[PDB]
Design a binder for this molecule. Structure first.
Ligand code: H2B
Ligand code: H2B
Ligand code: H2B
Ligand code: H2B
Lengths: 99, 100, 100, 99
């Protein structure tokens, strides 16, 4: 179950994915990725897809062209869990390759 | 190419070909929401739409959660609908048919 | 898991479920060659197989040219066929069905 | 039509994609990509896919796990053309992100 706002464990995880913003009573984390074209954006998403289905944890993301806008939270626990941070972390790494 | 006009005859004609889609409001764009069994399908779906989109250089605004993919289409440089939006819409429906 | 043995009863039974596939030679692996209209389909196809493969951690050897995707499956750490190879094979056939 | 072996134009293109080997009477170019896992390999392939269908020119590639083994040539001209080099180049760039 579901990580608590300003919680010790929470802030400790959020340390490792600093570029992501917390909602709005710590119920989720958002971040907005920007890549050079759609081709890059897709390459990105593609890796995230493979990982997501693997660990059975999925993003809510909104792609337009080179933008990919993500908001993450554990549905089944109605807020943040460990899973959301492992995802955000993966995304951050995957996206780093494009810098 | 030239920005199509609301309830225009051209427009309504194309729309007839892609009936599952709702027009905004008015008639600035077209929405539809796909539902597949799982993520795996949804992605198989999106994957093909990706290929087509980069080909014809015209891209969706879609929002994916799990097995649902929620699209809204319109030519940005046209600030409304044009031919390309319906070209897309149709692919997309065909692509999505295979999962029925 | 345990390396399945040639013409073994277990083996033949699974194979019955995935009949379009040819066994090597002998019976170290299983081959099949998919043909779709275009590349776009083939990729839609591969895309889903990708998702599944990284999930179940068991991966194909496939060779893609355009609209044909040519697979050969076998558990490497087992140096022959095992359950996983047939799990795959079946997905793959289902995945590929949607394009008929 | 179809670039000629040791041709001036040929060697000049091949300069820009040095890591690729020439066949065997300059009929095509091969190269073997190696990534950390399949997840990376797919991210790679995914970008190459998008470009390929766009420029209507496709690879012959053979993926196993983290390996992707490519051989490129213009089918319709039975040998190398410009197209093969634009592809190889794209691949090289796409793959560079993983170093
Ligand atoms: C229960 C549900 O049908 C699936 O197993 C998924 C999809 N992946 C998921 N992703 C997220 N973020 N929360 C979930 O509860 C979740 N469960
Ligand atoms: C003109 C522009 O900079 C790019 O070529 C793009 C990106 N892809 C596009 N996608 C959509 N939907 N409309 C466009 O006008 C468009 N043009
Ligand atoms: C044990 C090994 O290092 C990895 O976990 C992998 C890579 N994926 C694999 N794929 C296949 N086909 N057989 C394996 O044994 C396998 N194991
Ligand atoms: C003629 C053919 O059906 C397609 O238009 C393709 C696929 N892409 C291609 N790729 C390569 N390498 N050579 C081709 O001739 C080619 N043509």
């Amino acid at each position: 179950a579901r990580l608590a706002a300003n919680s010790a464990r929470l802030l400790q995880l959020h340390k490792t994915v600093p570029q992501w913003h917390l909602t709005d009573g710590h119920l989720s984390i958002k971040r907005k990725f920007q890549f050079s074209d759609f081709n890059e954006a897709w390459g990105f998403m593609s890796r995230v897809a493979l990982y997501a289905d693997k660990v059975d944890h999925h993003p809510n993301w909104y792609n337009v062209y080179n933008t990919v806008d993500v908001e993450l939270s554990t549905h089944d626990a109605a807020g943040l869990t460990e899973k959301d941070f492992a995802l955000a972390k993966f995304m951050d790494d995957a996206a780093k390759n494009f810098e």
